[PDB]
Design a protein around this ligand. Structure first.
Ligand code: HEA
Ligand code: HEA
Ligand SMILES: [O-][O-]
Ligand SMILES: [Cu+2]
Ligand SMILES: [Cu+2]
Ligand SMILES: [Cu+2]
Ligand SMILES: [Mg+2]
Ligand code: NA
Ligand SMILES: [Zn+2]
Lengths: 43, 79, 98, 49, 105, 514, 47, 261, 84, 73, 144, 58, 227
């Protein structure tokens, strides 16, 4: 709706870092397990 | 009449998809008829119809276990 | 054959339960258990809205069978009107003086 | 006054659109994905024995 | 509702109340804006006059902005309304939003 | 301080926040599971291994999304936050018990996670039908850990239901009749009645499944005279009501959202809407066997269950058309929340119509257990329940937090997710008509294209949910506090500011007895 | 009442530093998303 | 001075919900440990923490109402609803078990002999102990009503006396039922007839025990004058729960003991 | 049967005390009498190894895992017949 | 000048609705009747045409000779 | 003038087409010159200069209708960013294909699908509309 | 017996800033701590068991 | 069977499947109608600056939007019920065959005259002969005479299974202790595939059904060669 200006504004750069860290926290752990899938299946 | 046929015909007593009792009833009726005819010195061939029908409808495993049980004395149905 | 022995509310009720009980027999309602009866709502006979502070939310059911209540804060001061029907409401103080 | 969209909107729209189409076309045809489309009109039936 | 004529009349009277306060001026316009219609010139006229009595120039200009907005896509409505209101716009010295340049960006 | 507030809470707002946090976390677990599913099916062959490890994944996906994401969020979250604010109540009727409803959830989830770790997990399907779920085909602790998880979740929702009904009925301003409470409050009262009557039958059914597995009973074992079909009746007597329990609070939020963003004071046909929700609730209790059309029931009872299942479209239709009538003539504000609501209206309609096809027992013979049913339910759940949750979230987020979201990002989020979920489930209609079964870890070669397109769509949704996490971060990171809110006269929950104080309505609202 | 009130005070986690928040949010949602993948791995590593 | 102007109860932050929830985790995983890995330790810990949580939670509720006076009429009304809604869910719980019984007894499968009761099962005579149990429970519905009236009329001695009779009758039913369980020629493992009989009556029996202790709690609260002639919801709830337990038995008796045998 | 005891089966602590001691309790006594002149005792049923009885899909989590919770040696046979 | 004539000022939304509601029915019955003829009718014909000059024996033979059956070489 | 969070219970200013006359004036605090303009307003409006009229309007309201119904180029950023992220998704797929996915069944090679289509055509798979109905049995070519 | 609820009312209404579950005295505190301890300990034991069973145990 | 990029149902091999295809076109036409109607109204509601935000009357149009859907449901229900009832008149079969589901294969029994019984397993993908269908080929097909009304009885010896053949319009669950009956009736010779349609454990995706329909005379000699 209507609001005050950001008390601690997140610049483009900060957002880029924020988005990056977010995606990575999701993709790295899963990629690791999936990457070694066959490595687990062969016993 | 014919003790030779095609397959167990439609039985209005069991008109729905669940045919469990059709197999069961005909299986009982047979052994009940088999007893009387084989006991009162009668004709066991009258009982043929039921055996054909129950043979057609009943899974082999059911007929086998029920037979094993009638021999064992543990057949739950009343014959 | 009765011998009594069980307390009555008048003799054993305590805290808020006792408070609403006593206040009830004196004809008052400090705990908003009852629905307030409306006055004519004109500039001269406003609905008197009690409050223990300087503002209270008023819900105005403009017409008898309305499904939406009109809500708004009534502040200490001049009679304010419902945004939808103009009915008047004026704040007044509660039993406990602020 | 001019906003983020007035300035970058056009760039964002175009480069984003372009990037999308390229990576998808590449993925859909350059790596080994088997789409297994209908053989009708595509495959010449070969005797199986 | 009531006959169109009675509706118009009821509104002309509302705004013609000599001791109408700002609350009633606002409430009247804000309520009229929710109907499926662009108010008749005679209703706008009265609202415009009530603005004069309340010494509110700005509200008179915003009332004209609202009449154009309610017309939506029907662009022949506003000019016709501005036309019938001209005698009144001139008398009270009310400038149209276009004259003030408020139809800008 | 932190303990007294967060672990020993007796405050409706804090408990509601706890639920939203729990549900958000469960949603990530559920999302990962949904991707393991599509990863397995995105290429012919096998990725994980057999249908056991696969179905353990398919089963947990269902329980997590239904019991740990959709219900905690819609009912415990939005329910506890908004219900009291909307009726001017100081808190819920049983604030301490309410706190127990929440705390039963983490233990319940643990038991579900534990079931997939011991032995080979529960690969029974979310329906956990015996004999596959019995102590022979699934020997070991898994299924039992699963049953216990469902017991705690049921107790949780039942206690919560008692709380919501008592509150909504006993704690309104004395002058306010039930026909003066907003639609969302009605939506949660009815849902609560459904949970109250349906969860106990599930509890009885799975308790019987538990005794068959450990106490040598034979409720579902033919050997002792039991009947596996009996389980189906009991599970689905709860199971159909459960899907209406999952969509009703969403029907409520959509009414508020559509009304608010069209600039209206009230939704069109308020009483038609109350009537519609009661009807859907009532009718959803007498149609359960529409999930057992290939089980061998008599033809007459199948004719009844298809007829009865179909009339539920009439009351549902009046709700779809009333939402459209509300938009009519509105001053539309194209906010993210409004985008989520318009997508719900259309997508839910597609998913519901696809449900009418399946209502036909004759036609369900060939559609049952195929991916055509997977498509129907994902349209109503992934693009129905979930879309209401997202709309409700971006709309009310400022009230819960006091900070605003970046609206441009929120719209980018909607766009991506809209593409992802449609790409994922639309093609599954084809797979189903063409015969691809459900619960298969691999499929005949012909079904490759559609499954490939579908798995790709699920990756797009993945991007959408990762983005969503960023969006919540940036709001809390930037800290734009709220100033003014529009339409507060007909939206009480916003009258105490953003966020409302710990204790709201210490002094009740004043409502005249006109 | 005795509890703090207002923006950023009605939540069980601190929001007074966007970077520590990024980290806490990363662990929170990250751990949830990671769990199934590690359960599948654990099931594959038993036999 | 100057605080809340509504009649509702804002409860102090309590740790009982947390311990009660943890108790539930302990009892279920403890039951999982007993059933498979043959150990009762976890289940014992769990049962102990559950009793401790219920004792303290309900103790606090007495403190808040009797001692602190928070149960204004608005609050009592909510409690009535809560209790009524609770009984309804219990009724549906029992409905799942009656459904199962009726489903099994009306379509006896071939493996049972195609008849009910199954061949090999010798049912109890409904005219013996089950008739007794029936009269003991109905009698206690009469004595509890006398207790209630005594209370409302302010008669402490009679309320206490009637409450006592009610309780012994409940205990009497419990003992008689325990005897029947032991004398019974069939067991829970005797197929669907045994399954259906022992879990449906076992749950009811568990409910009779829960109601008896609830009444016992009311008995002691009465000895300590907690109840007034007009404010005694704990006894009303105890009384409603008791009639529900009575009604469920009538259905059991008619269904399982009479018709189903 | 039916029922009809004149009047007064509602309202008054005295009326309910009257019904408690004049109807309720005396019934409990008669049924207690009846249950005595019937329930002297039952001779145990013959053991037939029916497969739909004495079910054992998983051993009971107590004792030797073959005895039901309220096992009465005198009337409950194990899957292999009576214990004595 | 020229006096502009008085235009229509009331019920402009309702007026817009009455029109399109018809066009809404047109467009939707179009898609339906289109499905009927381009698809439904085409299929009734496809089945009717196929089974008219159909010989199950001729079909079986062609299949038998191609080596597909395992009970009829 | 400058709104504050804590003023939630007080009337607020808002610009919206369906509530043209807000409950509060945009500007509550007048300067010497403004107090004077407000005084000239009590006289004939014919005497106010256009600049004085505009100033009077900008004291009562924040934005004109024309300013509030203004269209943005926001959609460009939304569609562009959406496509960018959808594009970013294809990279996860490319990664998946390369490091997670193994080789597909041998039944997908050209030889097999060609034999298999023949066998399908031999068993008359979907002869009424779907597969074989699109094959010309007489010319041993796909119908066209 | 004797009617003593009035003394109790006094003990519990005493503005001592204690929550109702501790307002009764010093035994409330020991009960409370015993309860919390068995729950936390039992919960830890529980997690351990889950950890044990999750591995193939021969 | 299914072919690549298929959109609709498998071609109909029997008369009820044909009936279902047409009933589905009927139903699909109506869902296209309703869904396109809702989409038009929605776009119509969102494309005008004209407003009317005050209250509107509820009752008036509600009758149209209650009564219309009711008529449309009767239009879907009549055909539906007719076909449903048409599926149950088994009425005088000339052959009865049983099939028993098992943990990971189907077994068939033709027992009218003899005691013919055999197991039917999926042909592993590595043992497929060129041109054979990956997860669809079975080693021992279920031979049945074409153009004859056959009564199939479905059941199971372990967990639930479901016996299905899309092209013939059949799907009957296989439940232990129960005998479910369905009517099979092919109007063409050929091979017709199906798959287990009820989750049953580790190899649920790998236990197909293949029907071989040949003329009577070839069915008879086959029975005899199978013992
Ligand atoms: C919240 C989710 C949700 C909702 C709301 C519904 C809604 C409906 N579902 Fe669905 N359904 C599921 C979730 C849901 N379902 C799930 C999870 C399953 C699978 C369970 C499993 O097996 O695992 C399932 C499966 C399922 C089956 C089982 C099929 C099978 O297994 O073979 C059936 C059967 O009839 C069915 C029917 C319907 C119908 C008729 C509706 C109706 O309520 C829809 C009504 C809606 C509309 C009709 C659209 C709007 C109305 C109009 C615009 C009016 C005009 C319309 C007409 C005149 C036609 N559903
Ligand atoms: C609410 C329920 C729900 C939801 C939302 C989903 C969402 C998803 N499901 Fe579904 N699914 C089921 C319930 C659900 N599912 C059920 C009942 C089954 C049947 C199980 C069985 O057969 O036993 C099933 C089965 C199932 C199958 C069939 C498996 C098989 O038969 O072999 C497939 C196939 O792709 C699938 C995929 C997906 C995908 C890609 C998503 C994706 O759309 C997920 C994308 C992510 C989201 C849409 C949610 C993100 C939202 C949040 C994270 C909330 C955050 C909130 C706040 C911050 C406040 N699921
Ligand atoms: O279940 O729809
Ligand atoms: Cu359903
Ligand atoms: Cu199977
Ligand atoms: Cu299967
Ligand atoms: Mg199924
Ligand atoms: Na796969
Ligand atoms: Zn009003």
């Amino acid at each position: 709706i209507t609001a005050k200006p950001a008390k601690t504004p997140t610049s483009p750069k900060e957002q880029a870092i924020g988005l990056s860290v977010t995606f990575l926290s999701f993709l790295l752990p899963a990629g690791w397990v999936l990457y070694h899938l066959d490595n687990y299946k062969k016993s | 009449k014919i003790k030779n046929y095609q397959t167990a015909p439609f039985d209005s007593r069991f008109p729905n998809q669940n045919q469990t009792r059709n197999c069961w009833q005909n299986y009982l009726d047979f052994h009940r008829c088999e007893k009387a005819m084989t006991a009162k010195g009668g004709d066991v061939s009258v009982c043929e119809w039921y055996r054909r029908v129950y043979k057609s409808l009943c899974p082999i495993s059911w007929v086998s276990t029920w037979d094993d049980r009638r021999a064992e004395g543990t057949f739950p149905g009343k014959i | 054959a009765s011998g009594g022995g069980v307390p009555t509310d008048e003799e054993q009720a305590t805290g808020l339960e006792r408070e609403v009980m006593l206040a009830a027999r004196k004809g008052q309602d400090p705990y908003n258990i009852l629905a307030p009866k409306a006055t004519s709502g004109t500039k001269e006979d406003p609905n008197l809205v009690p409050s223990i502070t300087n503002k209270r939310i008023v819900g105005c059911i403009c017409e008898e069978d309305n499904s939406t209540v009109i809500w708004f804060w009534l502040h200490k001061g001049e009679a304010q009107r419902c945004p939808s029907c103009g009915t008047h409401y004026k704040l007044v103080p509660h039993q406990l003086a602020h | 006054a001019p906003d983020f969209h007035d300035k970058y909107g056009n760039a964002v729209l175009a480069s984003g659109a372009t990037f999308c189409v390229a990576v998808w076309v590449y993925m859909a045809t350059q790596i080994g994905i088997e789409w297994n489309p209908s053989p009708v009109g595509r495959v010449t039936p070969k005797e199986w024995r | 509702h009531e006959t169109d004529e009675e509706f118009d009349a009821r509104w002309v009277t509302y705004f013609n109340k000599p001791d109408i306060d700002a609350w009633e001026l606002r409430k009247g316009m804000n309520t009229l804006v929710g109907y499926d219609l662009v108010p008749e010139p005679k209703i706008i006229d009265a609202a415009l006059r009530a603005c004069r009595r309340l010494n509110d120039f700005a509200s008179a200009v915003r009332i004209l902005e609202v009449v154009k907005d309610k017309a939506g896509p029907h662009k022949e409505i506003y000019p016709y309304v501005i036309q019938e209101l001209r005698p009144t716009l001139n008398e009270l010295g009310i400038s149209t939003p276009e004259e003030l340049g408020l139809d800008k960006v | 301080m932190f303990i007294n507030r967060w672990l020993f809470s007796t405050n409706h707002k804090d408990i509601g926040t706890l639920y939203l946090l729990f549900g958000a976390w469960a949603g990530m677990v559920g999302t990962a599971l949904s991707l393991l599913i599509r990863a397995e099916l995105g290429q012919p062959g096998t990725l994980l291994g057999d249908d056991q490890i696969y179905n353990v994944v398919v089963t947990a996906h269902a329980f997590v999304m239904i019991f740990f994401m959709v219900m905690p969020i819609m009912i415990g979250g939005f329910g506890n936050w908004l219900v009291p604010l909307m009726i001017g109540a100081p808190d819920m009727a049983f604030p301490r018990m309410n706190n127990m409803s929440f705390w039963l959830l983490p233990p319940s989830f643990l038991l579900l996670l534990a079931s997939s770790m011991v032995e080979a997990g529960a690969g029974t399907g979310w329906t956990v039908y015996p004999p596959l779920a019995g102590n022979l085909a699934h020997a070991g602790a898994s299924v039992d850990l699963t049953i216990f998880s469902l017991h705690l979740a049921g107790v949780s929702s039942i206690l919560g239901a008692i709380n919501f009904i008592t509150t909504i009925i006993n704690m309104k301003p004395p002058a306010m009749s039930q026909y003066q409470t907003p639609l969302f409050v009605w939506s949660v009262m009815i849902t609560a009645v459904l949970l109250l009557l349906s969860l106990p039958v599930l509890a009885a059914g799975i308790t019987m499944l538990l005794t068959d597995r450990n106490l040598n009973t034979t409720f579902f074992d033919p050997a002792g005279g039991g009947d596996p079909i009996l389980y189906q009746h009991l599970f689905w007597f709860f199971g159909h009501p459960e899907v209406y329990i999952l969509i009703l609070p969403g029907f409520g939020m959509i009414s508020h959202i559509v009304t608010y963003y069209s600039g209206k004071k009230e939704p069109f046909g308020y009483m038609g809407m109350v009537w519609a929700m009661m009807s859907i609730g009532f009718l959803g209790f007498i149609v359960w066997a529409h999930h057992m059309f290939t089980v061998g029931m008599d033809v007459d009872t199948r004719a009844y269950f298809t007829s009865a299942t179909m009339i539920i479209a009439i009351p549902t239709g009046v709700k779809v058309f009333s939402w459209l009538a509300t938009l009519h003539g509105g001053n539309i504000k194209w906010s993210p929340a409004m985008m989520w609501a318009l997508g719900f209206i259309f997508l839910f309609t597609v998913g519901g119509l696809t449900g009418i096809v399946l209502a036909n027992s004759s036609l369900d013979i060939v559609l049952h257990d195929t991916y055509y049913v997977v498509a129907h339910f994902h349209y109503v759940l992934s693009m129905g329940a979930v879309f209401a949750i997202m709309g409700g979230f971006v709309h009310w987020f400022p009230l819960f937090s006091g900070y605003t979201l970046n609206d441009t990002w929120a719209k980018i989020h909607f766009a991506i997710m809209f593409v992802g979920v449609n790409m994922t489930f639309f093609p599954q209609h084809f797979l189903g008509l063409s015969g691809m079964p459900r619960r298969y870890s691999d499929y005949p070669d012909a079904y490759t294209m559609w499954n490939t397109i579908s798995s790709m769509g699920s990756f797009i949704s993945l991007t959408a949910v990762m983005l969503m996490v960023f969006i919540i971060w940036e709001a809390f990171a930037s800290k734009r506090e709220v100033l003014t809110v529009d339409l507060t006269t007909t939206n009480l929950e916003w009258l105490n500011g953003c966020p409302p104080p710990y204790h709201t309505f210490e002094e009740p609202t004043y409502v005249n007895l006109k | 009442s005795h509890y703090e009130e207002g923006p950023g005070k009605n939540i069980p986690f601190s929001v007074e530093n966007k970077w520590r928040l990024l980290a806490m949010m990363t662990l929170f949602f990250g751990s949830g998303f990671a769990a199934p993948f590690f359960i599948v791995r654990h099931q594959l590593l038993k036999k | 001075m100057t605080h809340q102007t509504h009649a509702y109860h804002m409860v102090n932050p309590s740790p009982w919900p947390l311990t009660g929830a943890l108790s539930a985790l302990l009892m279920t995983s403890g039951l999982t440990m007993w059933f498979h890995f043959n150990s009762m330790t976890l289940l014992m810990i769990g049962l102990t923490t559950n009793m401790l949580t219920m004792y303290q939670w309900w103790r606090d509720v007495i403190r808040e109402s009797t001692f602190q006076g928070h149960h204004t009429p608005a609050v009592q009304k909510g409690l009535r609803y809560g209790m009524i809604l609770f009984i309804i869910s219990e009724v549906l719980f029992f409905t799942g078990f009656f459904w199962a019984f009726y489903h099994s007894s009306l379509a006896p499968t071939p493996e049972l002999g195609g008849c009910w009761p199954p061949t090999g099962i010798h049912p109890l005579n409904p005219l013996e102990v089950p008739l007794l149990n029936t009269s003991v429970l109905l009698a206690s519905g009469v004595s509890i009503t006398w207790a209630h009236h005594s209370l409302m009329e302010g008669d402490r001695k009679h309320m206490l006396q009637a409450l006592f009779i009610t309780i012994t009758l409940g205990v009497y039913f419990t003992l008689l039922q325990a005897s029947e369980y032991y004398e019974a020629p069939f067991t829970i493992s005797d197929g669907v007839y045994g399954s259906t009989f022992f879990v449906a009556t076992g749950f009811h029996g568990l409910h009779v025990i829960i109601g008896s202790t609830f009444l016992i709690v009311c008995f002691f609260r009465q000895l300590k004058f907690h109840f007034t002639s007009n404010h005694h919801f704990g006894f009303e709830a105890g009384a409603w729960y008791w009639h529900f337990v009575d009604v469920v038995w009538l259905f059991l008796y008619v269904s399982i003991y009479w018709w189903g045998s | 049967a039916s029922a009809a005891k004149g009047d007064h089966g509602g309202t008054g602590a005295r009326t309910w005390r009257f019904l408690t001691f004049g109807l309720a309790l005396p019934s409990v006594a008669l049924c207690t009498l009846n249950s005595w002149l019937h329930s002297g005792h039952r001779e145990r049923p013959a053991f037939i190894p029916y497969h739909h009885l004495r079910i054992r899909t998983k051993p009971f989590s107590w004792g030797d895992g073959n005895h039901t919770f309220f096992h009465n040696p005198r009337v409950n046979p194990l899957p292999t017949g009576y214990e004595k | 000048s020229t006096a502009l004539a008085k235009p229509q000022m009331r019920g402009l939304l309702a007026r817009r609705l009455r029109f399109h509601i018809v066009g809404a029915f047109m467009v939707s019955l179009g898609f339906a009747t289109f499905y009927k003829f381009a698809v439904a009718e085409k299929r009734k014909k496809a089945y009717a045409d196929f089974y008219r000059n159909y010989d199950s024996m001729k079909d079986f033979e062609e299949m038998r000779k191609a080596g597909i059956f395992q009970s009829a070489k | 003038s400058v709104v504050k969070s804590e003023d939630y219970a007080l009337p607020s200013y808002v610009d919206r087409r369906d509530y043209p006359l807000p409950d509060v004036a945009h500007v509550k605090n007048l300067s010497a010159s403004q107090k004077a303009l407000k005084e000239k307003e009590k006289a004939s409006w014919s005497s106010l200069s256009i600049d004085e009229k505009v100033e009077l309007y900008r004291l009562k309201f924040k934005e004109s209708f024309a300013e509030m119904n203004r269209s943005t180029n926001e959609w460009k950023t939304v569609v562009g960013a959406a496509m960018f992220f959808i594009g970013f998704t294809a990279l996860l797929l490319i990664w998946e294909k390369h490091y997670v996915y193994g080789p597909i069944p041998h039944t997908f090679e050209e030889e097999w699908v060609a034999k298999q289509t023949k066998r399908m055509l031999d068993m008359k798979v979907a002869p009424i509309q779907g597969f074989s109905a699109k094959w010309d049995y007489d010319k041993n070519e796909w119908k066209k | 017996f004797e009617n003593r609820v009035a003394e109790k009312q006094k003990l519990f209404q005493e503005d001592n800033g204690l929550p109702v579950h501790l307002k009764g005295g010093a035994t409330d505190n020991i009960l409370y701590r015993v309860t919390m301890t068995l729950c936390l300990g039992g919960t830890l034991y529980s997690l351990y068991c889950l950890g044990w069973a999750s591995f193939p145990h021969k | 069977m299914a072919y690549p990029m298929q959109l609709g149902f498998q071609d109909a091999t029997s008369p009820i499947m044909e009936e279902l295809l047409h009933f589905h076109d009927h139903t699909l036409m109506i869902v296209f109608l309703i869904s396109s109607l809702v989409l038009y109204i929605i776009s119509l509601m969102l494309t005008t600056k004209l407003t009317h935000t005050s209250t509107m009357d509820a009752q008036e149009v509600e009758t149209i939007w209650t009564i219309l859907p009711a008529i449309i449901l009767i239009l879907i229900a009549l055909p539906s019920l007719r076909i449903l009832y048409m599926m149950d008149e088994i009425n005088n079969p000339s052959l009865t065959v049983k099939t028993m589901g098992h943990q990971w294969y189907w077994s068939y029994e033709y027992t009218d005259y003899e005691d013919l019984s055999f197991d039917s397993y999926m042909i592993p993908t590595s043992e497929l002969k060129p041109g054979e269908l990956r997860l669809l080929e079975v080693d021992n097909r279920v031979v049945l005479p074409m153009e004859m009304t056959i009564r199939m009885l479905v059941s199971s010896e372990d967990v639930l299974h479901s016996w299905a053949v899309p092209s013939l319009g059949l799907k009957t669950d296989a439940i232990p202790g129960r005998l479910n009956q369905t009517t099979l009736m092919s109007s063409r010779p050929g091979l017709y595939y199906g798959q287990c349609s009820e989750i049953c454990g580790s190899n649920h995706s790998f236990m197909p059904i293949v029907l071989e329909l040949v003329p009577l005379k070839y069915f008879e000699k086959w029975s005899a060669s199978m013992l």
